[PDB]
Amino acid sequence: PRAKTGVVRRRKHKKILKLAKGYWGLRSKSFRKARETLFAAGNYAYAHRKRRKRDFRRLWIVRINAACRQHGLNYSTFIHGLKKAGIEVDRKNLADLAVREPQVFAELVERAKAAQ
Amino acid sequence: MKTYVPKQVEPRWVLIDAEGKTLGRLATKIATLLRGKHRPDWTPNVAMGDFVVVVNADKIRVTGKKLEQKIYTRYSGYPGGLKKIPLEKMLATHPERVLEHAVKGMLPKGPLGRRLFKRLKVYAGPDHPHQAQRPEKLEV
Amino acid sequence: RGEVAYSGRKIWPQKHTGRARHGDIGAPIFVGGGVVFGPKPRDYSYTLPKKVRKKGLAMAVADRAREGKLLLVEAFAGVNGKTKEFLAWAKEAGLDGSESVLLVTGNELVRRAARNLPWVVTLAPEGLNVYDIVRTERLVMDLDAWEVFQNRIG
Amino acid sequence: PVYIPRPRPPHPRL
Amino acid sequence: MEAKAIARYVRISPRKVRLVVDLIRGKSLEEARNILRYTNKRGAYFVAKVLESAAANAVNNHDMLEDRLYVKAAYVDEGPALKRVLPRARGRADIIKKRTSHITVILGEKHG
Amino acid sequence: MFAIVKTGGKQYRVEPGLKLRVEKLDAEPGATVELPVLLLGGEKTVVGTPVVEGASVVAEVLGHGRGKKILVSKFKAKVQYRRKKGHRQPYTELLIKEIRG
Amino acid sequence: AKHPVPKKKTSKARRDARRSHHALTPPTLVPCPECKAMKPPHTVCPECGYYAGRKVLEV
RNA sequence: CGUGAGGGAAAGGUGAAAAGAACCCCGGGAGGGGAGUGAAAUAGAGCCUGAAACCGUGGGCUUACAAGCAGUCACGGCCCCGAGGGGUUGUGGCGUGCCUAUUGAAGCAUGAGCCGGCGACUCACGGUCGUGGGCGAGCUUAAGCCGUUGAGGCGGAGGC
RNA sequence: GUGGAGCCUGGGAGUGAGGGCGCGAGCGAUAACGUCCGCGUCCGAGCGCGGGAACAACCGAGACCGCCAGCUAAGGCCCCC
RNA sequence: GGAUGACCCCAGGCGGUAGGGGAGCGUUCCCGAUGCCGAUGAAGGCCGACCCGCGAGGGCGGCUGGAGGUAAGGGAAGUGC
Ligand SMILES: [Mg+2]
Ligand SMILES: [Mg+2]
Ligand SMILES: [Mg+2]
Ligand SMILES: [Mg+2]
Ligand SMILES: [Mg+2]
Ligand SMILES: [Mg+2]
Ligand SMILES: [Mg+2]
Ligand SMILES: [Mg+2]
Ligand SMILES: [Mg+2]
Ligand SMILES: [Mg+2]
Ligand SMILES: [Mg+2]
Ligand SMILES: [Mg+2]
Ligand SMILES: [Mg+2]
Ligand SMILES: [Mg+2]
Ligand SMILES: [Mg+2]
Ligand SMILES: [Mg+2]
Ligand SMILES: [Mg+2]
Ligand SMILES: [Mg+2]
Ligand SMILES: [Mg+2]
Ligand SMILES: [Mg+2]
Ligand SMILES: [Mg+2]
Ligand SMILES: [Mg+2]
Ligand SMILES: [Mg+2]
Ligand SMILES: [Mg+2]
Ligand SMILES: [Mg+2]
Ligand SMILES: [Mg+2]
Ligand SMILES: [Mg+2]
Ligand SMILES: [Mg+2]
Ligand SMILES: [Mg+2]
Ligand SMILES: [Mg+2]
Ligand SMILES: [Mg+2]
Ligand SMILES: [Mg+2]
Ligand SMILES: [Mg+2]
Ligand SMILES: [Mg+2]
Ligand SMILES: [Mg+2]
Ligand SMILES: [Mg+2]
Ligand SMILES: [Mg+2]
Ligand SMILES: [Mg+2]
Ligand SMILES: [Mg+2]
Ligand SMILES: [Mg+2]
Ligand SMILES: [Mg+2]
Ligand SMILES: [Mg+2]
Ligand SMILES: [Mg+2]
Ligand SMILES: [Mg+2]
Ligand SMILES: [Mg+2]
Ligand SMILES: [Mg+2]
Ligand SMILES: [Mg+2]
Ligand SMILES: [Mg+2]
Ligand SMILES: [Mg+2]
Ligand SMILES: [Mg+2]
Ligand SMILES: [Mg+2]
Ligand SMILES: [Mg+2]
Ligand SMILES: [Mg+2]
Ligand SMILES: [Mg+2]
Ligand SMILES: [Mg+2]
Ligand SMILES: [Mg+2]
Ligand SMILES: [Mg+2]
Ligand SMILES: [Mg+2]
Ligand SMILES: [Mg+2]
Ligand SMILES: [Mg+2]
Ligand SMILES: [Mg+2]
Ligand SMILES: [Mg+2]
Ligand SMILES: [Mg+2]
Ligand SMILES: [Mg+2]
Ligand SMILES: [Mg+2]
Ligand SMILES: [Mg+2]
Ligand SMILES: [Mg+2]
Ligand SMILES: [Mg+2]
Ligand SMILES: [Mg+2]
Ligand SMILES: [Mg+2]
Ligand SMILES: [Mg+2]
Ligand SMILES: [Mg+2]
Ligand SMILES: [Mg+2]
Ligand SMILES: [Mg+2]
Ligand SMILES: [Mg+2]
Ligand SMILES: [Mg+2]
Ligand SMILES: [Mg+2]
Ligand SMILES: [Mg+2]
Ligand SMILES: [Mg+2]
Ligand SMILES: [Mg+2]
Ligand SMILES: [Mg+2]
Ligand SMILES: [Mg+2]
Ligand SMILES: [Mg+2]
Ligand SMILES: [Mg+2]
Ligand SMILES: [Mg+2]
Ligand SMILES: [Mg+2]
Ligand SMILES: [Mg+2]
Ligand SMILES: [Mg+2]
Ligand SMILES: [Mg+2]
Ligand SMILES: [Mg+2]
Ligand SMILES: [Mg+2]
Ligand SMILES: [Mg+2]
Ligand SMILES: [Mg+2]
Ligand SMILES: [Mg+2]
Ligand SMILES: [Mg+2]
Ligand SMILES: [Mg+2]
Ligand SMILES: [Mg+2]
Ligand SMILES: [Mg+2]
Ligand SMILES: [Mg+2]
Ligand SMILES: [Mg+2]
Ligand SMILES: [Mg+2]
Ligand SMILES: [Mg+2]
Ligand SMILES: [Mg+2]
Ligand SMILES: [Mg+2]
Ligand SMILES: [Mg+2]
Ligand SMILES: [Mg+2]
Ligand SMILES: [Mg+2]
Ligand SMILES: [Mg+2]
Ligand SMILES: [Mg+2]
Ligand SMILES: [Mg+2]
Ligand SMILES: [Mg+2]
Ligand SMILES: [Mg+2]
Ligand SMILES: [Mg+2]
Ligand SMILES: [Mg+2]
Ligand SMILES: [Mg+2]
Ligand SMILES: [Mg+2]
Ligand SMILES: [Mg+2]
Ligand SMILES: [Mg+2]
Ligand SMILES: [Mg+2]
Ligand SMILES: [Mg+2]
Ligand SMILES: [Mg+2]
Ligand SMILES: [Mg+2]
Ligand SMILES: [Mg+2]
Ligand SMILES: [Mg+2]
Ligand SMILES: [Mg+2]
Ligand SMILES: [Mg+2]
Ligand SMILES: [Mg+2]
Ligand SMILES: [Mg+2]
Ligand SMILES: [Mg+2]
Ligand SMILES: [Mg+2]
Ligand SMILES: [Mg+2]
Ligand SMILES: [Mg+2]
Ligand SMILES: [Mg+2]
Ligand SMILES: [Mg+2]
Ligand SMILES: [Mg+2]
Ligand SMILES: [Mg+2]
Ligand SMILES: [Mg+2]
Ligand SMILES: [Mg+2]
Ligand SMILES: [Mg+2]
Ligand SMILES: [Mg+2]
Ligand SMILES: [Mg+2]
Ligand SMILES: [Mg+2]
Ligand SMILES: [Mg+2]
Ligand SMILES: [Mg+2]
Ligand SMILES: [Mg+2]
Ligand SMILES: [Mg+2]
Ligand SMILES: [Mg+2]
Ligand SMILES: [Mg+2]
Ligand SMILES: [Mg+2]
Ligand SMILES: [Mg+2]
Ligand SMILES: [Mg+2]
Ligand SMILES: [Mg+2]
Ligand SMILES: [Mg+2]
Ligand SMILES: [Mg+2]
Ligand SMILES: [Mg+2]
Ligand SMILES: [Mg+2]
Ligand SMILES: [Mg+2]
Ligand SMILES: [Mg+2]
Ligand SMILES: [Mg+2]
Ligand SMILES: [Mg+2]
Ligand SMILES: [Mg+2]
Ligand SMILES: [Mg+2]
Ligand SMILES: [Zn+2]
C-alpha cells in the first residue's frame, strides 16, 4: 500500500503559522520563516521568565532605596537593620509598603535604625 | 498582588546654583533627579522625574588641569572634520554646554532618556526665565 | 529507475549550466521517475510448524467447549437442501441466528442449505481451521466430522 | 531551454 | 440598496487600471463621469464602461435614482495571465505576462 | 486593616474579602486554613520579627486549579536540538475571610 | 560594467512605499460658460465648440 | 525538439436530470445586472471540493527625532468580547537568522525568492545475536500430491 | 569507599581533521592566533546562564518545569547600571 | 507502604554533538465488518480565547462541504521534509 503525504504536512504547517500570528512580513506568512522566528521566540520566553524575577526585584530595590533616603539612610543600611531586627518582609512587599503605607515603612525604618 | 504602577503625576520643578560646584559630581545628582530615582514610585518606562533648572553654570568648577587639557570633540562627517575644543574655550563661548554635555552623557540612550534631557534647563548667569513655574531651590 | 520508460541520456551537462547536476529523468528525484524502495511481488507464506497448527486446532475447539458453545449433532433431520429446511432445524436446536455459527459437516446437502445465512460460515471437516472457529461464536459438527477432528489432532 | 549560454571565462588568478 | 458591475477578463494590467479606479472611488456618478472623460489613460475607457453599466443596473433593476448615485466601492482584481514568448539575445526566451483584470464598481444612493 | 502573609514561599498583602491564588495547598475545598502573619497594618501597626505570635489570617479554600498553559521551548542551533514542553502551574484559590491578630 | 543585480527581494512594504508618489492627479476641469459642461480650461469646448465667447468649430 | 538514429510531454470530474439560463437592461463585443432552472448557481460550463504562496477592497489598533535576526518580558493607551480574555503597540529590559560544514560562523564560508505537491536506510536469500512461542535426544520437512476456491492436509527425500 | 562504581560474556555503535588555556620540554628567534610530545583543564558537545564593554575554551558555575519569594559566586556599589 | 502498575509516601538522578537504548503519536492498507457512524450531513476545507495529553497529537463546537467513513484489539508498509 502507498501512504502519500496528504493532509499531514499542511496541518503541521498550519500549527506553526497559527503560532506565528502577528509576526512581520513572511515571519507570519511563510511556514519556514515562521518556524525560525519561533525558535528564537521560545528561547527568549524561557530566558525572560528567568529575567522577570530579576527585573522586578531590581525595581523593588530602587523604590526601597528611594523611600529609605527620605528617612536618612541608604538601602544597604536598611536591609542590614531588618536582618538584625529579624524582620523578613520581602522586597516585593517592602516596595508596596514604601509607596502605599509610608507610615508603616516609616516604623520599618525605625526598627532598622534601632537594630544596628 | 501586582507591583504598583503610578498614575500620571504632575512633575516638580527644582533649581540649583552651580557656582563652585564640581562639574561631574553635580551631573550625577542632576541625572538622578531627571530619572526620578529619588521617588519611591520610580518607574523605568515613563518620564516622571523632576524638571531641573540650573543657574550660574558659568561658575562651574573643575579640578586638575582640565581647563587646558579636557577636550570636547565633534565630527562633521566630512574628511578631516574632527573638531577639538578645550573646556576653557567652551566656558568662554557656550558655558551652558559644559554641564549640558556632562548630564546628557549620564542619561540613558534611547527615546525616554532623550526626553529627560529636554527637562533640564541650564543657564549661564544667576537668572532664569522660569518664574512662572515657581521652582523649588535645592541644596545639593 | 531502470524499469521506467525514459532514456538514459544526461539531460544537460554536468558543469557550468547554473542548474543542479542530473542524469536521466528516471532518477527517483524526478517527478515521473522511478520509485526507490517500492513493493515488488512477494510470497507472504511461511511453513508454520505442523505441531503448532495441530495444537491450535485442538485448542480452538477446546475454547468453545470451555464456554459451553460447542454442539455435536447426530444428523440434520429434515434438511434436504432448502434454506428454510435448515432454519427450521436451527430452531429446534437453539440456533436462532443471533450468534455466528460454524457449520462443520460432510453433508453436501446441509452445507448448501446454510451457506446463505449471514450468521453461518459453512465448512467441510477437512477444512476445520482456527481462524473460522475463532471468527464465530459457537461451533456445530457432524458426529462424522467430530471423528475427523479427533483424527487430525491425534 | 536546451541551449545554455556558455559561461564567461574566469579572471586568470595565477 | 446597491448596484454592481464587473468587467471580467479585460486584457489590461491590473496595476495600471487601479490608478484610474483610484480617481473615482467615493465620487458621485457625475464627477466620476467628468473625471473619466479627461483622464489620459487607456484604463479610463474600460472603467467608464463598467461605471455606466453599473449605473444602468441601478436605474433599471434596483429602483435607484440616477441623481443620487455615487461610487460606494470599486476595486480591480487580477485574472489569469496570458503567457507569451519574448525572444532575447544569445538564444533565450523570456516569458512575457499579458496580465488580466476583473473590474468591479459598486454604486449606492447618497441620501441628501 | 491588611496583613502580609507567607504561603508557598511567597509573601502577599491581603485584606478581608480578597480572592487570591497561591501555590497549591493540601486542603479540601470549602475548608478553612490559617496563614502566618508577618505584618499587620492599617489601623494599628504590628511588626513581626519575623512571625507575629497571636496573629492569623483566616482563609477559605474555594478550589484548586491549573493555570493557562505556558509553552516551554528549547532550541540549540546547528545541532538539531529542539524540545517542546507544555507547563500548567497548579494553584489554589483562597478567599480572605478575616485577619485574626 | 559587471551586470549589477538586486541583492535582496524588495519587501511588500518597500515596494509599495516607493509607489507612495504614484497616484493620478485628477484632471483640471472648469464648466463651459455656454453649455455648462465640465471641460479643461483653455481648450475649445468639445460639447459646443465655443471659446472666448464665440463658436469656433462644429461638434 | 532533432539532418537523422532518436528524444518525448502536458491535459480527468457541472448537475439527480441540461432543467446548459427564454426574455429585458448597460455594452461594439467580451463581460455583467435582472428574470428563470435547480435541493444547492462564489454547482454557470474559465463549472465538485477549492488549501498555500501571491494580488486587492473595507474596518480596528498603530507609525513622519527614529538604530533594526524584527522577537521576547513588563507596564501603560486604544479598539473588541463578556476580578477575565482577544487584537494592536507607545516606552523600558534583554537579544549575533536557519541549515550545512568545521578546532571554531551572526558570520563577509555552503544551500535556500516564496508556496504547494514528489523526494532518500528496503526487499530477497543466506548468516549472527537477541527475543515470543512449539517440540525436545530429538526438531523440521523441500519439490510435489490431494482438498478448498481467502480450508487445510499429506509428503521424511533431505537439513540441523 | 554502594558509586550512571568495578569485573565477566555477548548485541549496536560512533571516533581515528581537534582547539584554546596552565605547567613541563623539544623545534622556532628565551617570534607567531607557530609547530610537536607529556600532565591537567575547558570548548568541542555547556556559541545555555553571571562576570570580563563587546568575544567557544580567562574568572564564577554544570540550565527537568513554574513563582512579581530568599542567600550567595566571580565581579561589583558616582551617573549610564 | 499494597502485595508483582492498583495508587501513595520519602529520598536521589534528570546540560548535551557523533552515537547506543526505551516508550509513544500520526499516515496508507487488512482483519474486526453481511457489523457500526452517516443527507437530522461522510471525508476534505476554514475558524476556535474551549477540553485531554510532557509532546507528537486527540477531542469538542461553529462555518464550509456534499458521500462517504470506520471502533476497542491486532496485522502489514511506497509511513511524517
Ligand atoms: Mg512523502
Ligand atoms: Mg503584531
Ligand atoms: Mg510582533
Ligand atoms: Mg505579513
Ligand atoms: Mg510586509
Ligand atoms: Mg500567521
Ligand atoms: Mg502578515
Ligand atoms: Mg500571506
Ligand atoms: Mg524560566
Ligand atoms: Mg536569581
Ligand atoms: Mg531608588
Ligand atoms: Mg545581609
Ligand atoms: Mg533579609
Ligand atoms: Mg496611592
Ligand atoms: Mg555637587
Ligand atoms: Mg521615569
Ligand atoms: Mg585646569
Ligand atoms: Mg534511471
Ligand atoms: Mg534506463
Ligand atoms: Mg527505459
Ligand atoms: Mg521509449
Ligand atoms: Mg522514448
Ligand atoms: Mg542508458
Ligand atoms: Mg542514452
Ligand atoms: Mg555541477
Ligand atoms: Mg559545477
Ligand atoms: Mg542561480
Ligand atoms: Mg535546478
Ligand atoms: Mg538554480
Ligand atoms: Mg547535469
Ligand atoms: Mg537527478
Ligand atoms: Mg539524473
Ligand atoms: Mg550514475
Ligand atoms: Mg511513473
Ligand atoms: Mg508522465
Ligand atoms: Mg533504490
Ligand atoms: Mg520475512
Ligand atoms: Mg454466502
Ligand atoms: Mg454465509
Ligand atoms: Mg459471520
Ligand atoms: Mg538548463
Ligand atoms: Mg549563465
Ligand atoms: Mg490626466
Ligand atoms: Mg442611465
Ligand atoms: Mg534583442
Ligand atoms: Mg529583445
Ligand atoms: Mg524568469
Ligand atoms: Mg513574466
Ligand atoms: Mg494577470
Ligand atoms: Mg501561582
Ligand atoms: Mg519557552
Ligand atoms: Mg525554542
Ligand atoms: Mg547552543
Ligand atoms: Mg542557526
Ligand atoms: Mg545562536
Ligand atoms: Mg558546533
Ligand atoms: Mg537544531
Ligand atoms: Mg541543526
Ligand atoms: Mg536546525
Ligand atoms: Mg515536553
Ligand atoms: Mg563599465
Ligand atoms: Mg567592466
Ligand atoms: Mg563595455
Ligand atoms: Mg554605470
Ligand atoms: Mg547589465
Ligand atoms: Mg500591503
Ligand atoms: Mg522602496
Ligand atoms: Mg517608480
Ligand atoms: Mg499616491
Ligand atoms: Mg468656467
Ligand atoms: Mg526541425
Ligand atoms: Mg522534423
Ligand atoms: Mg458531474
Ligand atoms: Mg456527469
Ligand atoms: Mg443527488
Ligand atoms: Mg450529459
Ligand atoms: Mg444596445
Ligand atoms: Mg452576455
Ligand atoms: Mg453589469
Ligand atoms: Mg447574465
Ligand atoms: Mg436539504
Ligand atoms: Mg461555497
Ligand atoms: Mg458547490
Ligand atoms: Mg458530485
Ligand atoms: Mg470551484
Ligand atoms: Mg477560484
Ligand atoms: Mg478563495
Ligand atoms: Mg487596507
Ligand atoms: Mg535630537
Ligand atoms: Mg513622535
Ligand atoms: Mg539588534
Ligand atoms: Mg517594569
Ligand atoms: Mg485586557
Ligand atoms: Mg498589552
Ligand atoms: Mg520593544
Ligand atoms: Mg530548521
Ligand atoms: Mg566545507
Ligand atoms: Mg572549511
Ligand atoms: Mg548577518
Ligand atoms: Mg551566508
Ligand atoms: Mg550576510
Ligand atoms: Mg566562498
Ligand atoms: Mg566547502
Ligand atoms: Mg549546504
Ligand atoms: Mg532559481
Ligand atoms: Mg513570498
Ligand atoms: Mg515543500
Ligand atoms: Mg537497515
Ligand atoms: Mg525493495
Ligand atoms: Mg535475523
Ligand atoms: Mg529466532
Ligand atoms: Mg512444534
Ligand atoms: Mg519446554
Ligand atoms: Mg516433521
Ligand atoms: Mg555514566
Ligand atoms: Mg558507565
Ligand atoms: Mg542498533
Ligand atoms: Mg542495540
Ligand atoms: Mg569514522
Ligand atoms: Mg586516519
Ligand atoms: Mg590524527
Ligand atoms: Mg595533531
Ligand atoms: Mg595532539
Ligand atoms: Mg593552532
Ligand atoms: Mg598556551
Ligand atoms: Mg603562575
Ligand atoms: Mg623534549
Ligand atoms: Mg583570545
Ligand atoms: Mg604559544
Ligand atoms: Mg611555545
Ligand atoms: Mg588539551
Ligand atoms: Mg565536530
Ligand atoms: Mg563553561
Ligand atoms: Mg564538560
Ligand atoms: Mg559561547
Ligand atoms: Mg559568537
Ligand atoms: Mg561569557
Ligand atoms: Mg559577556
Ligand atoms: Mg570570550
Ligand atoms: Mg560559554
Ligand atoms: Mg543539571
Ligand atoms: Mg543579600
Ligand atoms: Mg567578593
Ligand atoms: Mg545605581
Ligand atoms: Mg537515573
Ligand atoms: Mg538528556
Ligand atoms: Mg500509530
Ligand atoms: Mg489509496
Ligand atoms: Mg486479525
Ligand atoms: Mg467487510
Ligand atoms: Mg442511523
Ligand atoms: Mg437532505
Ligand atoms: Mg451542515
Ligand atoms: Mg481519515
Ligand atoms: Mg481516506
Ligand atoms: Mg484538533
Ligand atoms: Mg467537517
Ligand atoms: Mg457509496
Ligand atoms: Mg480500519
Ligand atoms: Mg491499530
Ligand atoms: Mg505489503
Ligand atoms: Mg518513499
Ligand atoms: Zn460648451
Q: Record the cell numbers describing residue G19, joined without a space.
A: 509607489
CB atoms within 10 A of CB D11: 6
Report all structural domains of chain E as residue ranges with CATH numbers, in order of start: 2-110 (3.90.470.10)
The gap between C46 CA and H129 C1' (Å) is 23
CB atoms within 10 A of CB G18: 9
Residues 6+ apart with CB under 8 A from A41: F73
Cα separation, G22 vs G15, whole angstroms: 12
F:10-49 Cβ neighbours of strand H under 7 Å? 17-20
CB atoms within 10 A of CB E8: 11
The CA-based angle C138-C144-C147, given to 5 degrees, is 85
Cα separation, C106 vs C76, whole angstroms: 11
Question: Is F101:F40 a contact under the CB 8 Å cutoff?
Answer: yes
Residue of chain E nearest D1, judged by CA positions: E92
Nearest to C117 by CA among C94, C92, C98: C98
Query: H helices then E strands: how many in chain B?
Result: 5, 6
Distance C15 CA to ligand 25 centre (A): 4
B:52-111 Cβ neighbours of strand I under 7 Å? 105-109
Cis amide bond preceding E87, omega within 30: no
The gap between A7 CA and J66 C1' (Å) is 19
DSSP secondary structure of C68-122: T-EEEES--TT-SS-HHHHHHHHHTTT--SSS-EEEE-S-HHHHHHHTT-TTEEE
List phi, psi (to 5°) of F5: -105, 165
Question: Is A75:A65 a contact under the CB 8 Å cutoff?
Answer: yes
Q: Which amino acid is at E93?
A: A
Nearest to A64 by CA among A99, A115, A110, A88: A99
First-to-last C-alpha distance (Å) of chain E:
15
Q: Record the cell numbers describing residue A43, joined without a space.
A: 528561547
Cα separation, E99 vs B16, whole angstroms: 72
DSSP secondary structure of F54-100: S--EEEEEEEEEE---EEEEEEETTTTEEEEEEE--EEEEEEEEEE-
Helix or strand or coil: residue B98?
Answer: helix
Question: Is G28:G16 a contact under the CB 8 Å cutoff?
Answer: no
Beta strand pairing status for F37-41 and F2-7?
Answer: antiparallel
CA B18 and chain centroid, separation: 11
CA E7 and chain centroid, separation: 7
- Cα C129 to Cα C71, C104, C125, E49, F101: the distances in Å are 17, 11, 9, 82, 83
Kindly list the residues from chain F whose CB atom is less than 8 angstroms away from the CB atom of residue A38.
73
CA B15 and chain centroid, separation: 12
Helices A91-100 and A31-70 pack at an angle, to 10 degrees, of: 60
Residue of chain F nearest A48, judged by CA positions: F72
Breaks in chain C (C to N > 2.5 A) come right after none
Beta strand pairing status for F57-66 and F32-35?
Answer: antiparallel
Kindly list the residues from chain D whose CB atom is less than 8 angstroms away from the CB atom of residue E91.
3, 5
Cα separation, B48 vs A66, whole angstroms: 14
Residues 6+ apart with CB under 8 A from B46: B8, B112
Question: Is F8:F33 a contact under the CB 8 Å cutoff?
Answer: no
Residue of chain A nearest F10, judged by CA positions: A90
Q: Which residues pair with F86 in a beta bridge?
A: F71
Distance E85 CA to ligand 30 centre (A): 26
Q: Which residues pair with F32 in a beta bridge?
A: F60
List phi, psi (to 5°) of B102: -75, -40
Cα separation, E58 vs E61, whole angstroms: 6
Helix (H) or strand (E) holding C135: helix C130-135
Nearest to C38 by CA among C83, C1, C90, C69: C1
The CA-based angle E22-E26-E28, given to 5 degrees, is 115
Residues 6+ apart with CB under 8 A from C132: C102, C121, C123
The gap between C132 CA and H128 C1' (Å) is 39
Residues 6+ apart with CB under 8 A from F40: F1, F2, F3, F46, F52, F55, F99, F101
CA dihedral E17, E22, E26, E28 (to 10 degrees): -60
CB atoms within 10 A of CB F12: 23
The residue count of chain G comes to 59
Helices B23-35 and B111-118 pack at an angle, to 10 degrees, of: 110
Cα separation, C40 vs A83, whole angstroms: 81
G9 at interface of A, judged by CB pairs closer than 8 A: no
Cα separation, F16 vs F38, whole angstroms: 16
DSSP secondary structure of chain E: --EEEEEEEESS-HHHHHHHHHTTTT-BHHHHHHHHHT--SHHHHHHHHHHHHHHHHHHHHS---GGGEEEEEEEEEEEEEEEEEEE-GGG-EEEEEEEEEEEEEEEEE---
Asked if the Cβ–Cβ distance from D3 to E91 is below 8 Å, we say yes
| d(CA A45, nearest CA chain G) in Å | 28
Helices A102-113 and A75-85 pack at an angle, to 10 degrees, of: 70
Question: Is G2:G19 a contact under the CB 8 Å cutoff?
Answer: no
Asked if the Cβ–Cβ distance from B42 to A100 is below 8 Å, we say no
User: What's the reported resolution, in angstroms, to a tenth?
Assistant: 2.7
Q: Which residues pair with B13 in a beta bridge?
A: B51
Cα separation, G40 vs E100, whole angstroms: 31
- Does residue F68 approach strand J to less than 7 Å at its CB? yes
Q: Which residues pair with B54 in a beta bridge?
A: B16, B122
- Cα B116 to Cα B15, B16, B105, B110: the distances in Å are 16, 17, 12, 10
The gap between C37 CA and J20 C1' (Å) is 27
Q: Which residues pair with E71 in a beta bridge?
A: E107
CB atoms within 10 A of CB B102: 18
Nearest to C139 by CA among C82, C110, C99, C96: C99
Q: Record the cell numbers describing residue C109, joined without a space.
A: 446437502
Cα separation, C1 vs C36, whole angstroms: 8
